[PDB]
Amino acid sequence: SEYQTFFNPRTFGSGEADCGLRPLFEKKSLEDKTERELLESYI
Amino acid sequence: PVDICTAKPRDIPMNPMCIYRSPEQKIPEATNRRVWELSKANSRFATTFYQHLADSKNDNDNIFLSPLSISTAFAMTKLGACNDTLQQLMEVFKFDTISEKTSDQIHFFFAKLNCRLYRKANKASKLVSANRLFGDKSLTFNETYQDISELVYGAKLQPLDFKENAEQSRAAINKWVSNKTEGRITDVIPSEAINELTVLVLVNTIYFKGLWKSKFSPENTRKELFYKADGESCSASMMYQEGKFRYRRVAEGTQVLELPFKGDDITMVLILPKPEKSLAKVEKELTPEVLQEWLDELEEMMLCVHMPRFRIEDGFSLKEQLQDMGLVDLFSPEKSKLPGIVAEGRDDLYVSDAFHKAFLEVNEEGTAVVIAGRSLNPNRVCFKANRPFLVFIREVPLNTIIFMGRVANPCV
Amino acid sequence: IVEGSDAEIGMSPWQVMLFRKSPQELLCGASLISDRWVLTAAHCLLYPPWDKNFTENDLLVRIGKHSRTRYERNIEKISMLEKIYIHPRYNWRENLDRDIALMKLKKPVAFSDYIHPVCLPDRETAASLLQAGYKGRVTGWGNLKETWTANVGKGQPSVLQVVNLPIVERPVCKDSTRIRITDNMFCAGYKPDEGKRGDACEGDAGGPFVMKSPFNNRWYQMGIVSWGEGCDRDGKYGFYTHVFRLKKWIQKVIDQFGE
Ligand SMILES: COC[C@H]1O[C@@H](O[C@H]2[C@H](OC)[C@@H](OC)[C@@H](O[C@H]3[C@H](OC)[C@@H](OC)[C@H](O[C@H]4[C@H](OS(=O)(=O)O)[C@@H](OS(=O)(=O)O)[C@@H](O[C@H]5[C@H](OC)[C@@H](OC)[C@H](O[C@H]6[C@H](OC)[C@@H](OS(=O)(=O)O)[C@@H](OC)O[C@@H]6COS(=O)(=O)O)O[C@H]5C(=O)O)O[C@@H]4COS(=O)(=O)O)O[C@@H]3C(=O)O)O[C@@H]2COS(=O)(=O)[O-])[C@H](OC)[C@@H](OC)[C@@H]1O[C@H]1O[C@H](COC)[C@@H](O[C@@H]2O[C@H](COC)[C@@H](O[C@H]3O[C@H](COC)[C@@H](O[C@@H]4O[C@H](COC)[C@@H](O[C@H]5O[C@H](COC)[C@@H](O[C@@H]6O[C@H](COC)[C@@H](O[C@H]7O[C@H](COS(=O)(=O)[O-])[C@@H](O[C@@H]8O[C@H](COS(=O)(=O)[O-])[C@@H](O[C@H]9O[C@H](COS(=O)(=O)O)[C@@H](O[C@H]%10O[C@H](COS(=O)(=O)O)[C@@H](OS(=O)(=O)O)[C@H](OS(=O)(=O)O)[C@H]%10OS(=O)(=O)O)[C@H](OS(=O)(=O)O)[C@H]9OS(=O)(=O)O)[C@H](OS(=O)(=O)[O-])[C@H]8OS(=O)(=O)[O-])[C@H](OC)[C@H]7OC)[C@H](OC)[C@H]6OC)[C@H](OC)[C@H]5OC)[C@H](OC)[C@H]4OC)[C@H](OC)[C@H]3OC)[C@H](OC)[C@H]2OC)[C@H](OC)[C@H]1OC
Ligand SMILES: *[C@@H]1O[C@H](CO)[C@@H](O[C@@H]2O[C@H](CO)[C@@H](O[C@@H]3O[C@H](CO[C@H]4O[C@H](CO)[C@@H](O)[C@H](O)[C@@H]4O)[C@@H](O)[C@H](O[C@H]4O[C@H](CO)[C@@H](O)[C@H](O)[C@@H]4O)[C@@H]3O)[C@H](O)[C@H]2NC(C)=O)[C@H](O)[C@H]1NC(C)=O
Ligand SMILES: *[C@@H]1O[C@H](CO)[C@@H](O[C@@H]2O[C@H](CO)[C@@H](O[C@@H]3O[C@H](CO)[C@@H](O)[C@H](O)[C@@H]3O)[C@H](O)[C@H]2NC(C)=O)[C@H](O)[C@H]1NC(C)=O
Numbered sequence: 138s139e140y141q142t143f144f145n146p147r148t149f150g151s152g153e154a155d156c157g158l159r160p161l162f163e164k165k166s167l168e169d170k171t172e173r174e175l176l177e178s179y180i
Numbered sequence: 181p182v183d184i185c186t187a188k189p190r191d192i193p194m195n196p197m198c199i200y201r202s203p204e205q206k207i208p209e210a211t212n213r214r215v216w217e218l219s220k221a222n223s224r225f226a227t228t229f230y231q232h233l234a235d236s237k238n239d240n241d242n243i244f245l246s247p248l249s250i251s252t253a254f255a256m257t258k259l260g261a262c263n264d265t266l267q268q269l270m271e272v273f274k275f276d277t278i279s280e281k282t283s284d285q286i287h288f289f290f291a292k293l294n295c296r297l298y299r300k301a302n303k304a305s306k307l308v309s310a311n312r313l314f315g316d317k318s319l320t321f322n323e324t325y326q327d328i329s330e331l332v333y334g335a336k337l338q339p340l341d342f343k344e345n346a347e348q349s350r351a352a353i354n355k356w357v358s359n360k361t362e363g364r365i366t367d368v369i370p371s372e373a374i375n376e377l378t379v380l381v382l383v384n385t386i387y388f389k390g391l392w393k394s395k396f397s398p399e400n401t402r403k404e405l406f407y408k409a410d411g412e413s414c415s416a417s418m419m420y421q422e423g424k425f426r427y428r429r430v431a432e433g434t435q436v437l438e439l440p441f442k443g444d445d446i447t448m449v450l451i452l453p454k455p456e457k458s459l460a461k462v463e464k465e466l467t468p469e470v471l472q473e474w475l476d477e478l479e480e481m482m483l484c485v486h487m488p489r490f491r492i493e494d495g496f497s498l499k500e501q502l503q504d505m506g507l508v509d510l511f512s513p514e515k516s517k518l519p520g521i522v523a524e525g526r527d528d529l530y531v532s533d534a535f536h537k538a539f540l541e542v543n544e545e546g547t548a549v550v551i552a553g554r555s556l557n558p559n560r561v562c563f564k565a566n567r568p569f570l571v572f573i574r575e576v577p578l579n580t581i582i583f584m585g586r587v588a589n590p591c592v
Numbered sequence: 593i594v595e596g597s598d599a600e601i602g603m604s605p606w607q608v609m610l611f612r613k614s615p616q617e618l619l620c621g622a623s624l625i626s627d628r629w630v631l632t633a634a635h636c637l638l639y640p641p642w643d644k645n646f647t648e649n650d651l652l653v654r655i656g657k658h659s660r661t662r663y664e665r666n667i668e669k670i671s672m673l674e675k676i677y678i679h680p681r682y683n684w685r686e687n688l689d690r691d692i693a694l695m696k697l698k699k700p701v702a703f704s705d706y707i708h709p710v711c712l713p714d715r716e717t718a719a720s721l722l723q724a725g726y727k728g729r730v731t732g733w734g735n736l737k738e739t740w741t742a743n744v745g746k747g748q749p750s751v752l753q754v755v756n757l758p759i760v761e762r763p764v765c766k767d768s769t770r771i772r773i774t775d776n777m778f779c780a781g782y783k784p785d786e787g788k789r790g791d792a793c794e795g796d797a798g799g800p801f802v803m804k805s806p807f808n809n810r811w812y813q814m815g816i817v818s819w820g821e822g823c824d825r826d827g828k829y830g831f832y833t834h835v836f837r838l839k840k841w842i843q844k845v846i847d848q849f850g851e
């Protein structure tokens with residue numbers, strides 16, 4: 138739906154499927170003080 | 181062909197016309213003991229010689245010389261010396277301490293010592309030299325002495341016309357030294373030093389510029405004041421870098437630093453006294469024993485180095501110093517004894533003058549520029565040479581002092 | 593980090609702190625890409641010119657930390673390393689080209705609100721976000737400013753620092769330095785006529801340069817803090833190892849040694 142794995146979990150371990158989503162932010166509909174500053178720069 | 185660097189004493193007979201006889205540290209790895217006792221004698225000579233030289237110059241004058249090159253040169257006269265001339269040579273250069281065999285074939289073992297040093301510095305660094313003895317053509321030189329000279333000293337005594345062409349002979353000598361060093365060392369012999377009474381002249385010049393093992397980046401270089409001994413400021417180009425270096429703060433706050441050249445076998449050692457203690461004081465209170473002791477105690481660590489880039493071209497007559505140290509008969513027309521140099525007939529031969537000139541160039545390079553990364557490696561200490569410091573260039577394993585000097589004024 | 597700010601709690605749950613076991617000292621930063629692998633910079637472990645060659649047994653990592661010195665009970669986790677892998681053609685002899693290393697933990701670490709892996713880019717994500725002008729986030733406990741004097745323990749932050757920087761054009765990077773650049777690096781940082789500033793500094797190497805995907809809203813590590821000349825110097829930029837361009841080697845180490 139959004140993220141497609143690349144490494145084999147056998148030798149890579151767990152966590153790739155959920156990589157990139159911070160427990161205290163994205164996963165809680167929260168943003169940090171300056172991530173907006175990053176999107177703005179995206180043309 | 182005869183490879184002096186591999187050949188042994190017996191391979192080729194080259195005994196002197198006369199010999200002399202006078203009434204701890206561990207030996208380095210892969211080293212011939214005779215070459216080693218020779219290297220230790222030069223250090224004892226360098227100490228006494230540097231002292232006379234310093235007490236004859238201005239505290240604000242730079243100094244740079246190669247005691248090794250001087251000892252080698254006078255070992256060539258020793259080859260044909262006899263009686264009091266020979267004795268004096270032995271005592272002044274500290275040859276009267278080493279063993280019999282080493283003493284008798286000293287010229288050979290100096291070649292051996294030099295072979296080893298030449299191939300180590302030229303691996304990456306710059307170590308060129310131009311040495312020679314010049315005699316008036318009216319004389320008849322000993323051919324056996326010539327063959328030995330060319331084999332062990334690189335060239336045989338060169339006949340020139342001092343009696344009829346002193347200036348032209350003067351120019352030929354300067355042009356010849358300049359040729360052999362690619363324009364690096366010029367005017368070794370000043371005008372007036374050679375006239376129609378000149379019979380024999382010694383000339384030994386040496387140049388160096390080693391590729392730093394870890395070089396300074398030019399973008400970190402800037403003007404900064406340098407405080408000379410008199411008391412005046414001075415705008416100098418200060419280089420800077422951080423890296424791992426052998427360092428040590430010794431007695432009375434004097435700092436010791438070793439900056440190795442590519443290869444690690446040849447390094448530069450800086451002695452920086454506290455702003456309070458004068459360089460002149462360290463120059464008098466330092467001996468080979470204490471220096472070796474400091475060098476033994478150095479620890480490797482991350483530190484910053486602030487060093488001025490400089491140039492030292494020091495040339496001078498060796499005559500006065502050496503006489504002052506006791507080498508008298510060699511320079512005297514009446515008393516000199518150098519039979520071995522001349523053929524049979526009757527010689528009134530003696531050394532007219534001896535000239536030395538050494539050139540040291542130090543800058544950022546000493547091919548891709550290197551960078552080291554952003555990991556945490558804090559500078560434990562910082563070595564800022566913004567005031568007079570001593571310089572030594574040595575061969576690590578053998579501890580052979582190749583060059584020694586003082587940077588008393590780097591600026592313009 | 594020069595000109596950054598105290599990161600917020602859990603703002604960078606993949607940040608890893610790399611220590612030399614004994615004597616203990618903070619060497620570099622690093623990132624968590626799974627529950628058993630940590631990515632970092634190669635010169636943080638291997639640098640022959642300084643006789644630096646750290647191996648599994650000389651190392652250790654602390655994960656999920658915020659404060660630089662205070663022990664954060666029940667939040668941070670220490671882990672030893674089973675093995676470390678340095679890119680075979682990492683060029684320590686000149687420009688640190690391919691400055692990358694992988695590290696396998698003794699045992700997998702447990703995730704939490706404080707420990708969480710970051711994503712590695714795919715060709716597409718790397719092609720749309722890796723554009724000049726676009727900003728990424730650098731983080732670490734490195735120094736707060738450049739220094740030229742003895743500086744053990746000087747200029748250090750009390751907590752994780754963070755700063756956002758814009759990727760620069762390859763033409764500008766190349767002309768800002770005389771160090772032969774390669775396609776395996778990319779530089780970030782503000783130009784002189786931009787007024788604002790900031791950069792990574794001594795101690796930030798190995799740390800991650802991340803970007804948030806506007807596509808799936810996930811964070812991706814596009815770079816690894818690698819090198820610079822000084823810190824935040826006018827007309828100079830910080831350099832980072834191009835992670836995606838080395839993904840082939842990362843995969844080669846993983847499904848060959850994580851067996
Ligand atoms: C000995 O000598 C010594 C010295 O000496 C001196 O001298 C001195 C001496 O000394 C000794 C001394 O002594 C002491 C002295 O002597 C002396 C003596 O004593 C003192 C004396 O005695 C006492 C003597 O004397 C004598 C005399 O004489 S006089 O003079 O003195 O005089 C005589 O005389 S006469 O004349 O006579 O004769 C005599 O004398 C004697 C006599 O008779 C008897 C007698 O008679 C009787 C006499 O007597 C005397 C007396 O006295 C006695 C005296 O006394 S006093 O009182 O007066 O005196 C009187 O009494 C009375 O007198 C009598 C009589 O006299 S009259 O004259 O008259 O006769 O006398 C008697 C007397 O004594 O004197 O006789 C005598 C005795 O004798 S007797 O005999 O018996 O003894 O003398 C003598 C003389 O003089 O001599 O002294 C001397 C002198 O001194 S002064 O000072 O002076 O001078 C000398 O001097 C002289 C000297 O000098 C001369 C010497 O020294 C010298 O010498 C010596 C010797 O020599 C011989 C030396 O030593 C030496 O040394 C040496 C060295 O050392 C240092 C040594 O050696 C050794 O050791 C060493 C060391 O060890 C430690 C070593 O080294 C080492 O080595 C090693 C090895 O090497 C070989 C190394 O190692 C290293 O390195 C190596 C290498 O190298 C090179 C390595 O290895 C290697 O490895 C490698 C690797 O492996 C791992 C390999 O390679 C291979 O394999 C590999 C792997 O494979 S596998 O299969 O497994 O895999 C591979 O690789 C691979 O590859 C692949 C491919 O590639 S390529 O390129 O090719 O194709 C890959 O893959 C990848 O890739 C890529 C990339 O690419 S690139 O490049 O481009 O980058 C890829 O691809 C991709 O990408 C690309 C690119 O891109 S971009 O864009 O980026 O650009 C692309 O392309 S393009 O074009 O396009 O671009 C591509 O594309 S394409 O289309 O093309 O395809 C792409 O592709 S893709 O597909 O990818 O697209 C890739 O991919 S990625 O991404 O991943 O990258 C990839 O894949 S793929 O498939 O794909 O392709 C890979 O990679 S990975 O990643 O895969 O992995 C790779 O892999 S890796 O890993 O590698 O990377 C490769 O290639 C293929 C292959 O092939 C090559 C190899 O192979 C196998 C291997 O090899 C092996 C190694 O490992 C590593 C390392 O480590 C280890 C090492 O290191 C460095 C080294 O180290 C160093 C060596 O070798 C071993 C050894 O050897 C054996 C040696 O030996 C030991 C030695 O020897 C000894 C020295 O030193 C030198 C010199 O100097 C010093
Ligand atoms: C031209 O230049 C050359 C180069 O130096 C000179 O050549 C040297 O000349 C000296 C003597 O003037 C030579 O020394 C003498 O060598 C003799 C060696 O013979 C044997 O010695 C022992 C024998 O027991 C053997 O081991 C050896 O293999 C030889 O077979 C010695 O016997 C001589 O003894 C001397 O004793 C006293 C010193 O204590 C002297 O005062 C005596 O006069 C006596 O000579 C001496 O040691 C030397 O070997 C020569 N070397 C070379 C390369 O040939 C020329 O002298 C010089 N000539 C001119 C015109 O200047
Ligand atoms: C030191 O001396 C050497 C030679 O003794 C100098 O090198 C010589 O440099 C000249 C030009 O400066 C060369 O001239 C050319 O000679 C060839 C003959 O081989 C001739 O065909 C050409 O028309 C030209 O005249 C000369 O070859 C070269 N000598 C050699 C062969 O090495 C050197 O310049 C001197 N160094 C200094 C400046 O003291």
Ligand SMILES: *[C@H]1O[C@H](CO[C@@H]2O[C@@H](C)[C@@H](O)[C@@H](O)[C@@H]2O)[C@@H](O[C@@H]2O[C@H](CO)[C@@H](O)[C@H](O)[C@H]2NC(C)=O)[C@H](O)[C@H]1NC(C)=O
Pocket residue numbers: 638640645647
């Ligand atoms: C940098 O240094 C490490 C450590 O090397 C030491 O000496 C070696 C001879 C070996 O005995 C090591 O265990 C010591 O710690 C190097 O690691 C070893 O390197 C050798 C040869 O390169 C290799 O055979 C070993 O497998 C390595 N470690 C082990 C398991 O012994 C490392 O390779 C060195 N690399 C560089 C760039 O110098």
Ligand SMILES: *[C@H]1O[C@H](CO)[C@@H](O)[C@H](O)[C@H]1NC(C)=O
Pocket residue numbers: 262263517519
């Ligand atoms: C040198 O002079 C001394 C003084 O008399 C003499 O005894 C000695 O034999 C001389 N040496 C030689 C052989 O030249």
